[PDB]
């Protein structure tokens, strides 16, 4: 009975640092963007565009596999999860 | 010698927008960081740390496969290349 073989379309977050409302908004927006879109650039831009419009510019969304990017990061806007087979790294700094 | 033995890392840049001195510094620093380091987080942080120290904070380095990140970007500090089997996305905005 191995877990994560038939279906695992849920954010397996561990590196969440953003507020509970932010962690939920990221999983809610990404799941929705995943419904309307299915491209790393389309899902990352769609959720970032909404966060940039509501929370104001500029959000740093990074949806994908396992990139090793080194950038600006804050303890208020920083979260890293995994949606089935795509790791989202949502964090606002600029 | 131009021909190696098995490994042949060379930045196959196309999305270079940064100045000629910047495109060369990115390929020169990444090749060097590739010699000292061989991790997406280690190579991206090493080159970013040097660019952050010399060009001042904060550089947005993204070394890896094919992430679809949507963030801040300027026509002065924005470059995307490929080093053998790792795509570097160096761009300073914040």
Structure report:
- The structure is a homodimer of 94-residue chains.
- The first copy, chain A, contains two helices and five strands; from the N terminus they run E-H-H-E-E-E-E.
- Chain A has helices at 20-36, 40-54; strands at residues 15-16, 59-60, 63-64, 79-80, 87-92.
- In chain A, strands 1, 2, 3, 4 and 5 form a five-stranded antiparallel sheet that branches.
- In chain A, helix 1 packs across helix 2 (40-54).
- The longest helix of chain A is centred in the first third of the chain and has 17 residues, at 20-36.
- The radius of gyration of chain A is 13 Å and the shape is globular.
- Chains A and B meet through helix 2, strand 2 and strand 3 of A and helix 2, strand 2 and strand 3 of B.
Q: What is the terminal separation of chain A in angstroms?
A: 45 Å
Oligomeric status: homodimer
Series of H and E elements of chain A: EHHEEEE
Beta-strand content estimate of chain A: 5-15%
- Determine the number of helices of chain A (DSSP H or I, runs of at least 4 residues): 2
What number of domains of chain A?
A: 1
CATH class of chain A: Alpha Beta
PDB class: contractile protein
Keywords: apoptosis, dimer, contractile protein
Assembly: dimeric
Entry title: Localisation of Dynein Light Chains 1 and 2 and their Pro-apoptotic Ligands
Summarize the topology:
The structure is a homodimer of 94-residue chains.
Chain A: E1 15-16, H1 20-36, H2 40-54, E2 59-60, E3 63-64, E4 79-80, E5 87-92
Antiparallel strand pairs in A: 1-4, 2-5, 3-5, 4-5
